[PDB]
Design a protein around this nucleic acid. Structure first.
Ligand SMILES: [Mg+2]
Ligand SMILES: [Mg+2]
Ligand SMILES: [Mg+2]
Ligand SMILES: [Mg+2]
Ligand SMILES: [Mg+2]
Ligand SMILES: [Mg+2]
Ligand SMILES: [Mg+2]
Ligand SMILES: [Mg+2]
Lengths: 142, 152, 129
RNA sequence: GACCCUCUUAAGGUAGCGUAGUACCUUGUCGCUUAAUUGGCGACUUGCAUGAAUGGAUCAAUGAGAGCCCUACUGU
RNA sequence: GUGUAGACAGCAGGUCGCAGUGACCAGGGGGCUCUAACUGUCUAAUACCAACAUAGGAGAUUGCAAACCCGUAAGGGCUAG
RNA sequence: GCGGUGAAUACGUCCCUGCUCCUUGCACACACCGCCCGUCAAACCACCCGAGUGAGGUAUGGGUGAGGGCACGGACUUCGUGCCGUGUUCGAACCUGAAUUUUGCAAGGGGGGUUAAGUCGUAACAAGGUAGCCGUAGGGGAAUCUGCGGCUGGAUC
RNA sequence: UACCUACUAGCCGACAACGGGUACGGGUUGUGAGAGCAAGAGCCCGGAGAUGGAUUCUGAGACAUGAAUCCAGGCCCUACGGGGCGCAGCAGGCGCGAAAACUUUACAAUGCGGGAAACCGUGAUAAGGGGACACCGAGUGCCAGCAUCAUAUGCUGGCUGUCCGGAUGUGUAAAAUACAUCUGUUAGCAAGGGCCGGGCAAGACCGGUGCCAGCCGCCGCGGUAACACCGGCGGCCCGAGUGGUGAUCGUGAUUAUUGGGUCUAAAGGGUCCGUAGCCGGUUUGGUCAGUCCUCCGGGAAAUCUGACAGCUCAACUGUUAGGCUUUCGGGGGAUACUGCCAGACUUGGAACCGGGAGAGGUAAGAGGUACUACAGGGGUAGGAGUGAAAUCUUGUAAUCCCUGUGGGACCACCUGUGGCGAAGGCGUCUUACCAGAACGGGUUCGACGGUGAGGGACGAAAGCUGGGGGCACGAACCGGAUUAGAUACCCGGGUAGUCCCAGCCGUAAACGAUGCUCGCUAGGUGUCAGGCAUGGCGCGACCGUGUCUGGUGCCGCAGGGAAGCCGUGAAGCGAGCCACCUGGGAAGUACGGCCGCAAGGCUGAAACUUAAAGGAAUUGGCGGGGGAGCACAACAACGGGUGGAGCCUGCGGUUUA
């Protein structure tokens, strides 16, 4: 932050160091987001459902949130996936092929009163779980 | 402004008036003042108080106004100047005395800092003078060997 | 240490305008200071100015006629061409044909309107309005 | 099993270390080592019967000291 | 090439054998623990050790006609301290 | 509700207990029945150390070393981009010690977080009941405690 | 040096070498008002690669995508003696995954090699097929009259063919679309997608469910009246599109040169000295390198902008005027500006002298009082301490008093909203040594200056190492109380330590929570040093008021801040340099590194978790703050009784249909 005429180098250096204090630019250049998330920048995924858990909600609210436990096939990463909609666990069971996607909440992380769950189901056996929840599609016997 | 190593600013300047001419109320001449300067220099009196004794006992308002030359200009003209400037010699003399004192009082850290400040002033004077060719390029201020009173 | 006399003079003029003082003294005068004061006088923003020598760099007894709003130096003194004045004008100035930028040029020091008339650019010096 | 009290003829073992060169139960239980190990090392340790100059823990270097393992070697 | 010199160091090419420190001479190496710090000393004739000693640490007595010790005594060691 | 009879005490102060008002303090707003810290255990999650135990990359010396290229020598043929040999040259592949780097597993240990209607205290918030915070050192189940300097970001004097 | 030889001892790097991470480079693309910021798959330019790797033939040219050779690696045809192959060429297949087409057509054109030519080949190219690629253009309706609940199907009236189907020709290599006439339609075949509590445009309409099902980017909903959630009803926005999750730009001046903050919210480094860097006084003389105007060589097209021309409008192709390409090489003019050259100038800093000020520093010594140790004299039942106690201490005579001799620490009042010091910090006195300051100065110097990442010294207290000392104080420790407990506050002992001598660590709320330098900006107001006028003063050593300069405090206008506030001693207005912060935890933690004897200091993440944390201010409640006041649901002073005994009734719980 030198205001002299022949002081572009100092301003460039001090802007270079101060940029790192931002979380977003440093995490982008360091590649923490690619290294961390199971999908690796893939917008959705495909994992084998293993166990189904109706995980509880936050402290003020009170509810049970149906969350399958799914292991990815692209990477073999074990995570937890929240299945939305009424009758959510009715259209999904153990050992399925289900597309998964990020829950799209706070900072890309877990959304709402669901603690510790960041992934959500979007389709079971390559068909839309939203339409199964609505009632315009039927669960394949596969 | 603030001082060199203490930030205590001060304004005890010696207010010299706007005089573009020599005195009109004094009968002193350029030859008289230059003879007085040379005699006082040969006595062993430094240039800071040569002008002071000119201005006090002879009432000489300024040597440059009358003679057209300052004290050191007259010194260089007559080959009656030292090889080292008086400010650098004074700083080196004070530093040598302070080092002599500090070689027996090793707890006197405040005067160690005072010695460091005077060393900084000495290196500043040497850098300015080597910038302006008063002193040789290869003669660096050695604080242990090449710092004597008359350097040769 | 004193190391920007033109900016110091314009800051003093800014202070004197802000208090509304008709007159104010200018700390040590310079040739570019006199050129800026002459061009500002021809702009009508500043009334009068005299170099009163003091056996020193010299000072000014400037009579502020109450016509300006703020005036400081341009740091850095940017190089400017004939096709590069409008961005500085949009930055410093408040409005089109309102206030002028003091420019230093090989022809002479002058506001950028007359520099654009001259078709010669150079270094920005200051701004007054 | 982090508390009121004990058992208190002075005191109730602190730091550490712990199946030890000390540990009866005992070839204690778990991991590495092996096809297989009453062994070696690491960890746990309710310590029959550890513990601070009755010195405690730990230690580079040194050792014809005492165990175990790998490679090389070989009529062991 | 260095050196005064003895000698030492180095380079190019050729060539033999299974093998060129050709015999003699001449460390096998490494990792993890226990124990003692180390060099040293030790049961001459079954124990060369982890034992003894060691520097280091700490404690105690004594101001010299002392503390400690020898002698029956004369008088002595420590102490030409 | 009424009547008979008939007494001590206090010519009060706000100390006790409620309560009212102005000011100061406040981490309190469901307003002190407030908020609130740490250990301990239990469930779960992510992580770190871990004696160990693998896998992969880069580079390095070295090794064994396919194949090819020129040199030279020797023979067979249509007298050689052939053959044998030799020397030289480039050299893949594989093996190996260190170096470097990326990650899987691991008995056990660690602190972090988060969920009970957990247990234990009450450390801070008012002068939070011993003012607190800061550095440092010691002690204790745990908040924390004491000592030293410092500050006031502390009320009342 | 590409290799070899003799020789020299260099070369690159702290202005980032070497290494790690990542990546085909640019033309450009994304986005924004712009400065910028982010990516550079496709079209063109250059680069490299052919399973990984090495080697080689052929040729003008290769280490060849349709050449070989061998090794690794996988696969393959065999009559088992052997022989091939690698689609990062075009379609296609397996695998892979969130992740993408036809094994169509033709040399007709544009190119290329071949030929002398005629011409042949061409998965180059063109032509299509398929894929909610990007853009652009259209339509599913139109429509008079008439009716309710104001736009829905009505009743009716006709009318058009952009679409869809057909005919026919233009047409292309031949297709197809497109294209023209005709004509097929009861205008019927051709609309969906999200969402409805807020942010945000849309329903406080009716049943369901009951902290459950669910919603929810965030906020927030539901444990009984859900505009919130499910169907409905209705409504809303968009439009052959419409959403979701990343990403990325903008939002966001949330990376800030433009353009941010850093007293109390995250953030000034403990102070300071100081290199590279960076910033720099007025001034004469000379140059013209940055700079400036201009010229000439460039900066491929493509994409960008506008128009014209031509595709029906459109995007699109050509011409053209601009843009980008940039921020190159070289000439002429100018000399303000800055950098270069040589002086000067006195104010900035530097140097010297004068009378004064100062708990400024080291070194030495002496001193003040208290305390304490022992001893002596007197005296005799307790002293000490507490909220109250006890330990403790005392009959071995303490406490208290008197005398005397040693001891170590400690420097009171004086003392100040005083002073000196870089900060830390410094209070007995004397002396020696040293240093800075302000003040006075027709004194010497001539810009010699500011700041300053790295780096260096100083650095409170605690702690550590070695030697001393130990009166007092006093972590630990022990004991006595307090309490439910007390490992605490209280009290009795008291070790290390505080002190000194020689070193180390290097941190504090090291604070003014305000880095340092300069100019500038109303005032009123203590006091301190110096200087200076004057009145008094034993008209002297001295003390008063005024005034300039430099400090040291309070008050406060303008100014600014979110405010508390700051306010010539800025947090005001400009100049310069540096340090520092970028939502709250995890965390000043882990790993690596340096530093230290150690404790530790320095550097410093990530996973994960979370919607706030936080700052000033304010209205109340509240306190074991303060002040004021009041009342037998307070107190004092009183009188009685309930509580005791029996009965009566009411509440709880046992029983109970
Ligand atoms: Mg064995
Ligand atoms: Mg030994
Ligand atoms: Mg021994
Ligand atoms: Mg692990
Ligand atoms: Mg304690
Ligand atoms: Mg302090
Ligand atoms: Mg100290
Ligand atoms: Mg500070």
């Amino acid at each position: 932050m030198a205001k002299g005429k022949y002081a572009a180098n100092i301003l460039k250096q001090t802007r270079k160091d101060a940029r790192w204090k931002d979380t977003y630019y440093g995490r982008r250049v360091l590649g923490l987001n690619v290294k961390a998330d199971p999908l690796g920048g893939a917008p959705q995924g495909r994992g084998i459902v293993l166990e189904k858990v109706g995980v509880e909600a936050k402290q003020p609210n009170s509810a049970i949130r149906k969350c399958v436990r799914v292991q990815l096939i692209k990477n073999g990463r074990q995570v937890t996936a929240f299945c939305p909609g009424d009758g959510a666990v009715n259209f999904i069971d153990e050992h399925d092929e289900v597309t998964v996607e990020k829950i799209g909440g706070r900072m890309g992380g877990a959304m709402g009163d669901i603690p510790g769950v960041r992934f959500k189901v979007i389709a079971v056996n390559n068909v839309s779980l939203n339409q199964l929840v609505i009632g315009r599609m039927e669960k394949p016997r596969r | 402004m603030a001082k060199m190593h203490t930030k205590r600013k001060g304004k005890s300047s010696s207010t010299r008036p706007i005089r573009t001419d020599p005195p009109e109320w004094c009968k002193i001449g350029a030859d008289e003042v230059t003879t007085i300067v040379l005699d006082l220099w040969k006595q062993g009196v430094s240039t800071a108080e040569i002008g002071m004794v000119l201005r006090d006992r002879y009432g000489v308002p300024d040597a440059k106004l009358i003679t057209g030359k300052k004290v050191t200009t007259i010194l260089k003209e007559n080959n009656v100047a030292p090889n080292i400037p008086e400010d650098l010699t004074n700083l080196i003399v004070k530093a040598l005395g302070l080092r002599k004192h500090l070689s027996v009082n090793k707890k006197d850290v405040h005067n160690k800092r005072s010695l460091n400040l005077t060393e900084s002033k000495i290196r500043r004077l040497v850098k300015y003078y080597k910038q302006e060719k008063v002193l040789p390029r290869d003669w660096f201020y050695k604080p242990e060997t090449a710092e004597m009173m008359i350097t040769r | 240490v004193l190391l920007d006399p033109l900016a110091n003079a314009l800051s003093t003029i800014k202070n004197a305008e802000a208090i509304g003082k008709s007159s104010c003294v200018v700390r040590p005068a310079s040739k570019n200071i006199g050129n800026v004061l002459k061009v500002m006088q021809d702009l009508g923003y500043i009334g009068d100015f005299e170099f009163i020598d003091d056996g020193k760099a010299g000072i000014y007894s400037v009579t502020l006629v109450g016509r300006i709003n703020k005036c400081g130096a341009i740091k850095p003194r940017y190089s400017v061409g004939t096709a590069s004045f409008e961005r500085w004008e949009k930055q410093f100035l408040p409005a089109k044909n309102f206030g002028a930028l003091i420019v230093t040029t090989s022809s002479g020091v002058m506001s950028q309107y007359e520099a654009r008339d001259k078709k010669i650019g150079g270094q920005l010096l200051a701004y007054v309005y």
